[PDB]
């Protein structure tokens, strides 16, 4: 029966929005408590039911330059290769999916603004697993490392996804295959034993449950690669989606959102606590995040917590608080927009970034709350 | 007497903002006319008198690692090093200042859309040069390489400029020691006989008339550095700005304007043909444009035509042109906006963007035209 009998269990205070496949965001209130999300509150995509995997006998599977295969234990990709911890962001296309179907409705699990989290993620570099298959620095022209899960679809279609050979080689862009986050093992939902972790780039390609590494002259011809995960014009409708016409999302745009306080809330007079995260895609840094109580016609500065990374591996979020003055029986629109390290900037207005998918959601947030008397 | 009188003579129909220093853009009918900009036409901003430089007395001077010098003339520049060609959109960090200025006054030349062309540079890696120096590939830590022009004021400081040395080193970065401009020797005006081409990075640090490459552990010191070039808050004063708190401008966001047709003008009934630029820095592709003409509300998307570069390395504008229908006695508010290969987008509008230099002025560029009978 059940496809999901096996699926681990959850945390209980979870934001759900889909239990089979799991897919579930932490409560806003506790995603900005900690600049490292906890294990159990990471937001979790799942497209498929979690694969249940004995340890021993896992064998990751890399095709070499020639197509011969190298095959590989757990116990081998944590001892032939020097473990290297990258503090990144994982952030889904869809974060903020639901603002976007307040103004037409969209296809997509409703995420609400916390379809982002931040771990400490613990592996081997994607660059070296590869230079020891045998690949050089440098391929000639076009090419696409290609990743495959162990999750399948009923008919047997792996969840695949591809990053461009150039990243995957770079020491600077930081791609794991990652056995560790937080300092534990991978949880299940998470991706146990080995997932890739691409830095800067959308979650979708950071394949969880990995079972095989290929490397290719096109991307990875998985649907989720070819006909999913790209984002499209305010005008383009179901009948007439064009994939052949967009790029495959890779690196996202500068975002950010409120979570401190929540929306409809009571605030009491005098001081107020604004608190929030941001992020750009890319390794850029988020180097001001601008905060609004008035809707978007004053602002002030926000101060920015953060790990102060080199010049384009800014891979984990700032998180930002602002505490300023609020009077009795008023009512505000408090409002944040954040700036990276190449000036990029988010837009005022939801409507004309609205797309069909519903993915890349990076209009301005706005929390409208009031003041007790 | 005059400081200035030994500057070259200028094509009449520049739009010129200031003569002495000169700084001049084209007329924004010939500007998208062609994907590489006349080097007549190509937008020109001088802090200083331009240099008179003698070509074979002529020298580049290099520090080397350990604190000797190597000096380079004109003829040793083209032979020693192999010629490499580079297309690549030069855009001032204030281009679209104007349009600021009508929100709030600001400081600074008052350039319309055109502070921004593009040219094939051909000339020495500046990779290879300071390989010939003798550094290595990394250095550790966080480096600089300055550049020092031979304009000066009357006191004696050049302008100067810098760029992280991971970039000089990169052979991907393209940045070039360029004596060629669309296929003829550098113009005077332009940084005769030799200039940095930095693709994807404000204009500002493409260093002209180049007399001095130094390798050091800090930015350059220079005013232009270090207390200028730099963007800022809606909210921030003269009396209040810290150019401690934010990085110097190096690559820039996503932009895009209409140059045909022009504001105020008067249509033909039945179809007209809009035209335009767009551009991201970063070596980002642009990989839409959206033009509106009722004033953002409906959207199409534009051709785009361009010289497909590489992944990461679209240094190039892309031009785009979109024919619509055009009904008798209607006005019409013309709006573009572009899209880069990281997705990132422009803002609605610029009172959010707002800032006392004028720099990175990037909201949608909007144009009102009215249709004849
Ligand atoms: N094998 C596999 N990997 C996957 C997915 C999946 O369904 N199967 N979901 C992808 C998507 S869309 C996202 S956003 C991230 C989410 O990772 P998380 O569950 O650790 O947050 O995993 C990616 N990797
Ligand atoms: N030596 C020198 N180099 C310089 C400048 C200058 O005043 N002196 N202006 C800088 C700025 S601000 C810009 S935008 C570009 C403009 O180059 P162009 O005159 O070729 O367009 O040159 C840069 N390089
Ligand atoms: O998260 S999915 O629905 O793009
Ligand atoms: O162009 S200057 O005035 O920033
Ligand atoms: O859908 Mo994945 O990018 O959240
Ligand atoms: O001022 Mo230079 O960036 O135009």
């Excluded at 340890?55 to 011969?68: A, E, H």
């Excluded at 969209?106 to 590869?130: E, H, N, Q």
Aim: aromatic letters at 8%; glycine letters at 10%.
């Amino acid at each position: 029966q059940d496809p999901f009998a096996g699926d681990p269990p959850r945390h209980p205070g979870l934001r759900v929005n889909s239990q089979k496949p799991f897919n579930a965001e932490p409560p806003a209130e506790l995603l900005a408590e900690r600049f490292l999300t906890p294990n159990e509150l990471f937001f979790t995509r799942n497209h498929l039911p979690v694969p249940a995997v004995e340890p021993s006998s896992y064998r990751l599977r890399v095709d070499g330059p020639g197509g011969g295969t190298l095959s590989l234990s757990l116990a081998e990709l944590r001892s032939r290769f020097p473990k290297h911890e990258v503090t990144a962001t994982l952030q889904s296309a869809g974060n903020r999916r639901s603002e976007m179907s307040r103004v037409r409705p969209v296809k997509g699990l409703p995420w609400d603004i916390g379809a982002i989290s931040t771990a400490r993620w613990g592996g081997a570099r994607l660059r070296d697993v590869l230079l020891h298959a045998g690949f050089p620095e440098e391929l000639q022209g076009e090419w696409h490392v290609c990743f495959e899960g162990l999750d399948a679809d009923p008919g047997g279609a792996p969840y695949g996804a591809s990053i461009p050979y150039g990243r995957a080689l770079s020491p600077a862009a930081d791609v794991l295959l990652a056995y560790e986050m937080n300092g534990t093992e991978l949880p299940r939902d998470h991706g146990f034993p080995v997932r890739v972790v691409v830095p800067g780039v959308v979650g979708a390609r950071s394949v969880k449950w990995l079972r095989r590494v290929a490397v290719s002259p096109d991307e990875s011809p998985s649907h989720w690669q070819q006909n999913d995960y790209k984002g499209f014009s305010p005008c383009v409708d179901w009948d007439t989606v064009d994939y052949r016409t967009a790029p495959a999302i890779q690196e996202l745009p500068v975002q950010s959102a409120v979570t401190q306080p929540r929306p409809g809330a009571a605030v009491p007079p005098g001081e107020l606590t604004v608190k929030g995260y941001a992020w750009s895609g890319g390794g850029r840094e988020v180097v001001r995040v601008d905060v609004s109580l008035d809707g978007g016609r004053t602002w002030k500065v926000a101060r920015l917590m953060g790990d102060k990374a080199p010049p384009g591996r800014a891979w984990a979020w700032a998180l930002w608080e602002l505490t300023v003055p609020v009077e009795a029986g008023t009512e505000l629109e408090i409002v944040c927009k954040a700036v990276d390290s190449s000036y990029n900037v988010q837009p005022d207005s939801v409507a004309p970034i609205w797309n069909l998918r519903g993915v890349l959601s990076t209009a301005w947030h706005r929390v409208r709350v009031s003041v007790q008397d």
